[PDB]
Amino acid sequence: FNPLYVMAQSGARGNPQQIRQLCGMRGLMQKPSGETFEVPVRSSFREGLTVLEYFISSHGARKGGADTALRTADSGYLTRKLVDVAHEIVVREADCGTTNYISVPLFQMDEVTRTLRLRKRSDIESGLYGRVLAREVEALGRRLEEGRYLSLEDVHFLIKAAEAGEVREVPVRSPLTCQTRYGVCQKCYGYDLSMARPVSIGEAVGVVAAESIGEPGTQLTM
Amino acid sequence: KIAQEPVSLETPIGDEKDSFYGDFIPDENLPSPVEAAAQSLLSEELEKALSKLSEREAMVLKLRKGLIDGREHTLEEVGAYFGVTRERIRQIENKALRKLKYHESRTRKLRDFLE
Amino acid sequence: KKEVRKVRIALASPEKIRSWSYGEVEKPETINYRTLKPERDGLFDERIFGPIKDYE
Amino acid sequence: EIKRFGRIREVIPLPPLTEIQVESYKKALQADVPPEKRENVGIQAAFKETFPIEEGGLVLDFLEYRIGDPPFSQDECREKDLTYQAPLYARLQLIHKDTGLIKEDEVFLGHLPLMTEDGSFIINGADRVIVSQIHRSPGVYFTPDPARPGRYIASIIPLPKRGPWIDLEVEASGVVTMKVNKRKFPLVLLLRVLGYDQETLVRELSAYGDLVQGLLDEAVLAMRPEEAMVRLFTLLRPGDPPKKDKALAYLFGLLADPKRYDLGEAGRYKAEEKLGVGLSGRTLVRFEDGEFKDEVFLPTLRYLFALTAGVPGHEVDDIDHLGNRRIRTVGELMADQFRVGLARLARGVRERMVMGSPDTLTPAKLVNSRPLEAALREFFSRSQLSQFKDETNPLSSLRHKRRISALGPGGLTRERAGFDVRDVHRTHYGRICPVETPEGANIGLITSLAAYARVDALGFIRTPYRRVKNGVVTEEVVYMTASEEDRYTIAQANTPLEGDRIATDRVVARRRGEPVIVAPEEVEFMDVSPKQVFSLNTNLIPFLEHDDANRALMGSNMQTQAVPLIRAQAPVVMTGLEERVVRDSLAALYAEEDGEVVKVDGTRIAVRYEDGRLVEHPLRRYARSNQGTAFDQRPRVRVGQRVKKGDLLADGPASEEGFLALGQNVLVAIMPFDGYNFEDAIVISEELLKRDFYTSIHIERYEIEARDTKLGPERITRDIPHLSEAALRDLDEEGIVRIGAEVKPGDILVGRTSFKGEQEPSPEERLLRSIFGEKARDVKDTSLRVPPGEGGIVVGRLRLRRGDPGVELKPGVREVVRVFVAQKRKLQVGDKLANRHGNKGVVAKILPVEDMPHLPDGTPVDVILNPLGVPSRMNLGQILETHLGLAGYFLGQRYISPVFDGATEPEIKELLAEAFNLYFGKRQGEGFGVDKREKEVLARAEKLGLVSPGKSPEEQLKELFDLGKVVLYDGRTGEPFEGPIVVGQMFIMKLYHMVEDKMHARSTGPYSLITQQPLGGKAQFGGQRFGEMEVWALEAYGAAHTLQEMLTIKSDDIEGRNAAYQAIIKGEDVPEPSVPESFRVLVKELQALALDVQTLDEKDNPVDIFEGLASK
Amino acid sequence: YRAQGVKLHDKHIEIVVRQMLKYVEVTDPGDSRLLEGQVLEKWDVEALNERLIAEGKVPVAWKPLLMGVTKSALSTKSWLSAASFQNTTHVLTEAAIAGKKDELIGLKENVILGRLIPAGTGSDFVRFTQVVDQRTLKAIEEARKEAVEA
Amino acid sequence: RVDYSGRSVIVVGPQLKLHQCGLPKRMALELFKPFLLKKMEEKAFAPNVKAARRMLERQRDIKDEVWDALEEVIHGKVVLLNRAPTLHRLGIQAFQPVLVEGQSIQLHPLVCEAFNADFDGDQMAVHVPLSSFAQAEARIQMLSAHNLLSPASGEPLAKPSRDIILGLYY
Amino acid sequence: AEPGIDKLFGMVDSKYRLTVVVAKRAQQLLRHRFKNTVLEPEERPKMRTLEGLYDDPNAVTWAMKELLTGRLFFGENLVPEDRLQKEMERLYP
Amino acid sequence: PQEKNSLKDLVYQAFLRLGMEKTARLLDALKYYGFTLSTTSGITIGIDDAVIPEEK
Amino acid sequence: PEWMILEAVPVLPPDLRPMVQVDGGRFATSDLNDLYRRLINRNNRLKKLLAQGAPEI
Ligand SMILES: [Mg+2]
Ligand SMILES: [Zn+2]
């Protein structure tokens, strides 16, 4: 029931390596030249760092601050560009009317370990969710028909099926496969995900999507 | 003063690289929207408070303010337009005017615009 | 008078440019040092570029 | 009372931290130094170098320069909007090479700004600051080729603007093509005029091998020194003819000329001891009787080719190495502009000679003022390192003038920053603060000078290290440079210092900055104090070693954002520095000797000094500062007593009792109070407003000149044509407002009145005038009102009439006025506030003293901050700051905990054990006992483990007490809290940004003259920007018309924005827009490039963009 | 993204790429007015070929063209987009020379054009929507019989 | 830049619903001047437009008469509140104007996350959707209470904040 | 959380279609000063004010609650735009 | 114990099995309640809450 | 294509880059103004040289 523990453990504030440098040790620091140092920093922030540990830390710390703070601007370089190429993308035809489509695996081969395992939950959700079926599906009794709108439930159903080895490929409607001129279509796109329902026809889907990809931009340093 | 040349609108203001000189200048050339309505208001409110004037002392009260053809019409000509004399129109304006002053001081509808 | 759904852009010709113009400004004098009013040929000229005061 | 801690006693105190500004500027002044013994460096270098000015000719030489007496004191300037500058006279002699006319005359230069005591200058009444510039020290250097790893490219470089770049690159052509001033050419082309032919080219080169081939060339070496002197000159200058005498002059002036090439004394020094040579002047070569001998190029070239070989000792140099990087100081900077700005007059001298009356012209007609004067003022105003002084508080100016700017005209930019000049070199240490830097995109650019760090005339920042021998503390304090430091073994201030010797075998040490636990005896140096490892503000944070550097940075910078309070109070937990802070900042007035306070007089504090003389120091009580927070000297000295020399007399704005007092120590409960303190938010008790805590006063400047237009001038009076009765209230004589009058936003200050531009009133308006009868008078109202949101009271009444003594106004302007307006502001809702540990926040509402999580003693908490931004920001210092506060408030004694050396867990634990042990006395003694609610909480803890079971509540509440926590009730309910909540005194501060100012909203205001868009900032009174990101955000949702209004109706569109006000005023719906008017601009704009702007409609047809306008 | 912990959805990313490769290169123009090595959007070539098959002519042969997002945005049919984008100098020339007609196909072009955006509520799909209350609705429901007999 | 708009710092909304935002009095006044000018036209007190205009535009003398009158045009229509940068479309959400004291601006703590907000002194701006059409847009697809799911995930946005989580968990 | 939201969105297909309907109707409610509406004095928007509790003048809300009944008709190509302004701006002043 | 994730799943499942306004109110309920729920406990952070493992 | 070589000069309207005074007594001008100025100066002096019969250089 400790406040610090529960704090991050519940999902409020804090992360594991962050707690480590509080109740534990702060961990060996890195040199700005890029080669990590050869001496640890031991004592936690609660214990307090000696002048050395603190300076030696300040190296890669004040370094990192500059890393993130620098990439902040780079986010614009990404976003703006993505905007200028997505502006002309809107959902016009409800029906694009193409037999074209693409399939995604529910398993990603672990390199050098071979043996295709499975994509973690969020991963499958990362493009099966809110989709629209391209073709018939048969597994474990009840079969999906042509056209159904995949929901967070349907996705899990696909997982269950995949484990049964009855399904691997997932035929869906992609923006690529869409014949909607200067934009996409209902089927080819999907749920409005902010409404968890089919995207409103006339929506800024591409244009919105740009923002969707751009927002995470300042958050990837590594 | 004369000697001193003009000033480039691209001259940076402050110490930061954003601010421009020209972007710091207002536009009073065109009447502001607040003035669009302020003026269009008086142009009407003076039309309704005018109708309480005789068919002569009104249509004539406009000709002396450049309200009619936009150019001002002197007393001499107004008296020629109504068939009256360079004297009659003169008193007409006086009385017609203050006769409106009573309606103004009693309705407070136009009592603003005193700048 | 007509819904504008289209806007093109292209090159212009010396003639078309002559048409766009209301006159040929010559003198470098922006405005007088005294009257600060548009010079005869001044860049800011009020003679062929239209009045600074509405209808006046 | 007070209590100190730690066993690390600073041996040597902190040097005058304001000297890096003052002293360094003093060298370049030499005001007292006679015009003989002047050091020739700095200001006398501008004369030494730019003289004699020659042309049967003229030999005009330099003699002296008279140090001017300030015309107007630093005060007069600040109130006259004039620069604090003094006429610098100059004495010289004009002679002729033939006539022998020795004609001498004392000419005059211009006016040079003078520095104050603190280290800031005065520019047009606004005080500014000259920061420091950083770059690799001049000299020679060697680094691997950025285009190839297999070799090593070297280079040479003097002081900026005092000489051109130098580098000898090795192209992939196998030859060696040196590149200087952006162009390539083989080394032979140099050696030609250097006195080294084909023979001398192979003499010592064979000690290399493959390096003897890349140099030798027959197509060149057949050309002796004056023979090919012109050859390289042709490639150098495509314009001027390849004359044999032009290459005798130009190229010469670029090398052997110490006046056009100033190779900094450091460069002439540092480079001298590496390469193994004797270079005399600041030159490269020597103009020795005709051809040009070599003092530099060969001795560096052998090193360049030595490293690329692998021979021991010749190696790459560290570019970021502090020992290789000098600092441009105030005098060293100002002098830089004095010289070039003097040469700009040197040519103006040589030109005014070749004509007129060559017989005898006094140098008075020859010399000029403007070419020098304006050249200096240029740097003293529009340069980078000349920035607006920070007076937001006393510490502001201190740190501000103590910062190091990597920027400036002179060697870096926002582009080549990537890591190198951003990151922190291993040797930073006791030179520059590894943390305190702008948190913005400028990180690692503007740093701050370390405590004991000093910058000598050589630019090599040096750090104190207490010398030690045989493991014994020596009283010999060495200022060892960032260079030498990379040689010896430096111990640490936290080393086992006992009985003036080393205790434990394993001692803290390092070489070049690499941690090593080595034997005691071998310790040649040590760290004087941990304080030097950081900057000023950095060392103002207690238990800072517990706070992650990240937020600690903000904690250090925000020290400046903080604002003084009339009633403010020094932190009950200090580091033992803040004392001197107020002294060295010169923000406090002490006694020059041992005085005797005679008459306090909150204006004039007199102290009859022991020296028998009677001296008094007037007080600055309540006077405007560069931002809002005034300066105050609160007399703390009784109307008589004998003071001590150096003892304080009158306080300062952030200075309480000679201590740095930013905010006021306040008890804070760490807990989620109704989600009000959620996510670095703040909560405050009304009880603070009662005692007027964190409340300040802000003065502002309001000026207006009586404009003299073409239509004719005007005046500031009380008369106004349409003005009403009351609106004239405090105008009493000349149209000014009396002192101490409240001006709510919307009121006025002065009386400006000018003839309106005469224009016939609109017809409706003409009749409107006739009806009522107030005529349209010649003159219309002008007078300057007060800004929307700065309600003050008038204090400074400053009038300046044209035609008065010591006032020169603008050319053709009448009387002006600058009125001061001051206002008291209590802590408002949403005002920025932070602790010393770098935890930002805005006051979220307030809270009735009635409802408060008080304690058994009936003392309600005054703030209550949520424990959210503690773990993520790792601010564990604030935890101790408040933890001590618990015992602090109870025992009434303050603390001193130096950074990294201070009170620890056992110590604090004891202070809290005593705190509780005494607290119980005011309970059981006062006739009370253990409360039931207390039992509730105690039991809960006994279940959680916070209090060991089997122990009575007396022991449990005690253990919970030393934990920093206690039993808190709820002033809203009265029931206690399930868990305990830490509390106690903490140092916090109300930051600069206050909603009282920033917050703004407009309806329909002015617009940019160009396009009908509004105006950014609350200043010009305009709306915010909807820039492209916002537009896209709208496109996302799919709100069309919302975007329409943005692009047209609610922004720019001509008839649209008006039709809007029309509709809304008439209670209806606004029509859909048409012409954005900005776009209309774009049309003709493109047309100016002969771009036919063809607008089509619904089917490929003409459209008239500009309604009936340009249709000709 | 999944590495850094971003729950981002495939659709978006897909649209992007769709824009990247949506252009093709002209190879053996066949019977068309095109030239070997010219470039244009997938829909254009697809259309012209679809028509060519009916006209009897041989379809235009081609090969996929994968370019960068920037380059794509600068090659888009709408000249306005690239005009407001960047490298403005080069863009305007290329447009003006051939006299490029922007129909405001995209939104940003309309943004600058200060007109009703073809997307959102402004979408030509719903912007023509009508609204009537019962009373007035059945008021106008009768009027069509006032023009048939008269 | 636009007309009818402004900015200020931010303050948490512990009593505030998803569709709510604290809007300062003195702010909302000059923000809604064109509207209130009509609601004052209708509701007696000053005879006409200019009357009310100069009436309130002068001094600080705002009587309760104009307070309630202002609230009459406030209820219903909701104003858009934005926080820079505009990265996620959620960086702009529509909320119901709530006349409140003080200077700073309130807001729902759950949506602040989508705005990348924290109360360090952050400054948010505000605009007003004038035309009925646009206003409608503001209250429906543009409204905050409406879009609760992240368009880049499908997962919620207005999900419990760092604090609330700690409470419910506890 | 405008009442009937779920039902509102659920009525039409897209979001925009709905917004457009609410828009045009809300405007129509203003052009006729509320004497058009298909609702009843109990159903009409109610704004509670200290002075008196009147009908909420907000057009938007008017249209909002208006569609919830369904008495209103919509969709493209409904009736000729011509006679739609002859029998609309006539029946009400 | 209902922590972040569980709450998340609750929000989704609700918004899908219920509707916009309904779940809108639901959220605010957990907000207003959670704030006070946390308030009563208060759960402060002391230096002694940072306790170091004996295995260090 | 010959249009690329232009005889006329499309001169932008005056009010699009004006010169207007501000408070304090001094005026302010756009950059494009002085640019256009240098343009006509050379343009006129050229004519002056032409009819003059000045040499090729
Ligand atoms: Mg912030
Ligand atoms: Zn499709």
Numbering used by the authors:
A (entry chain D): 1017 to 1238
B (entry chain F): 324 to 438
C (entry chain D): 2 to 57
D (entry chain C): 2 to 56, 62 to 1118
E (entry chain D): 1356 to 1505
F (entry chain D): 622 to 791
G (entry chain E): 2 to 94
H (entry chain D): 905 to 960
Paper text:
Transcription initiation is a major control point of gene expression. The initiation process is best understood in the bacterial system where the conserved ∼400 kD catalytic core of the RNA polymerase (RNAP or E, subunit composition α2ββ′ω) combines with the promoter-specificity factor σA to form the holoenzyme (EσA), which locates promoter DNA and unwinds 12–14 base pairs (bps) of the DNA duplex to yield the transcription-competent open promoter complex (RPo). Here, we determine crystal structures of Taq EσA bound to an us-fork promoter fragment, as well as a complete RPo, refined using diffraction data extending to 4.00 and 4.14 Å-resolution, respectively, allowing visualization of key features that stabilize the upstream edge of the transcription bubble. The results also reveal functionally relevant holoenzyme interactions with duplex DNA just upstream of the −10 element and potential protein/DNA interactions that direct the DNA template strand (t-strand) into the RNAP active site.
Examination of the structure near the upstream ds/ss junction revealed the solvent-exposed aromatic face of a conserved σ2A Tyr side chain, Y217 (σ70 Y394), that does not appear to play an important role in the σ structure per se, but lies along the path the −11(t) base could follow from its position in duplex DNA (base-paired to A−11(nt)) to its position in the structure when orphaned by the flipped out A−11(nt) (dashed line). The −11(t) nucleotide is almost always a T, being complementary to A−11(nt), the most highly conserved position of the −10 element. Second, structural modeling suggested that the A−11(t) purine base present in the synthetic promoter construct may be too bulky to stack on Y217, which sits at the bottom of a narrow trough in the σ2A structure. (B) The T−11(t) base orphaned by the flipped out A−11(nt) stacks on σA Y217 in the us-fork (−11 bp) structure. The 4.6 Å-resolution electron density map (contoured at 0.7σ) is shown (grey mesh). Also superimposed is the simulated annealing omit map (green mesh, Fo − Fc, contoured at 3σ), calculated from a model where σA Y217 was mutated to Ala and the T−11(t) nucleotide was deleted. We also identified another conserved σA aromatic residue (Taq σA Y217) that plays an important role in the promoter opening pathway, possibly by stacking with T−11(t) orphaned when the conserved A−11(nt) base flips out.
